[PDB]
């Protein structure tokens, strides 16, 4: 699906 | 499905 | 926090 | 906190 | 806290 | 606390 | 506390 | 305490 | 935080 | 099913 | 089924 | 069934 | 059935 | 299903 | 934060 | 922040 | 799907 | 899909 990664 | 990862 | 909305 | 909503 | 809602 | 709701 | 609701 | 409800 | 919306 | 993990 | 794990 | 584990 | 474990 | 992981 | 909107 | 909009 | 990564 | 990376 869609990807959002927050570091 | 959709992915959200929060570090 | 962070927001991801998938329609 | 963080929000992910999947419709 | 964190929120995940799946419809 | 944390929230997960599955419809 | 933490919440999980499954419909 | 913690809550889990299964319908 | 950061925003990603997918229609 | 859906996955939410809170550390 | 659905999974919620709270550490 | 559904799983909720609270540590 | 459904599982809830509280530590 | 959908994935949300919060560290 | 940063914004990405996908129609 | 930065903006990207995709129609 | 769509990708947004925030460092 | 579309890509936005923010360093």
From Swiss-Prot, chains A, B, C, D, E, F, G, H, I, J, K, L, M, N, O, P, Q, R:
Note: [PSI+] is the prion form of SUP35. [PSI+] is the result of a conformational change of the cellular SUP35 protein that becomes self-propagating and infectious. This conformational change generates a form of SUP35 that assembles into amyloid fibrils. [PSI+]-aggregates sequester soluble SUP35, resulting in defects in faithful translation termination by read-through of translation termination codons. [PSI+] can be cured by GdnHCl and by deletion of the molecular chaperone HSP104, which is required for [PSI+] propagation.
Function of the molecule: GTPase component of the eRF1-eRF3-GTP ternary complex, a ternary complex that mediates translation termination in response to the termination codons UAA, UAG and UGA. SUP35/eRF3 mediates SUP45/eRF1 delivery to stop codons: The eRF1-eRF3-GTP complex binds to a stop codon in the ribosomal A-site. GTP hydrolysis by SUP35/eRF3 induces a conformational change that leads to its dissociation, permitting SUP45/eRF1 to accommodate fully in the A-site. Recruited by polyadenylate-binding protein PAB1 to poly(A)-tails of mRNAs.
Lineage: superkingdom: Eukaryota
Family, as annotated: Belongs to the TRAFAC class translation factor GTPase superfamily. Classic translation factor GTPase family. ERF3 subfamily.
Protein name (Swiss-Prot/TrEMBL): Eukaryotic peptide chain release factor GTP-binding subunit
Domain characteristics, as noted in the entry: The prion domain (PrD) is a Gln/Asn (Q/N)-rich domain, which is unstructured in its native, soluble form, and which forms a parallel in-register beta-sheet in its amyloid form.
Record lineage: Eukaryota, Fungi, Dikarya, Ascomycota, Saccharomycotina
Species of origin: Saccharomyces cerevisiae (strain ATCC 204508 / S288c)
Shown stretch of the complete protein: 7 to 13 of 685
Subunit and partners: Heterodimer of two subunits, one of which binds GTP. Interacts with polyadenylate-binding protein PAB1, and TPA1.
Gene name of the encoded protein: SUP35
Protein location: Cytoplasm
């Amino acid at each position: 699906g869609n990807n959002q990664q927050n570091y």
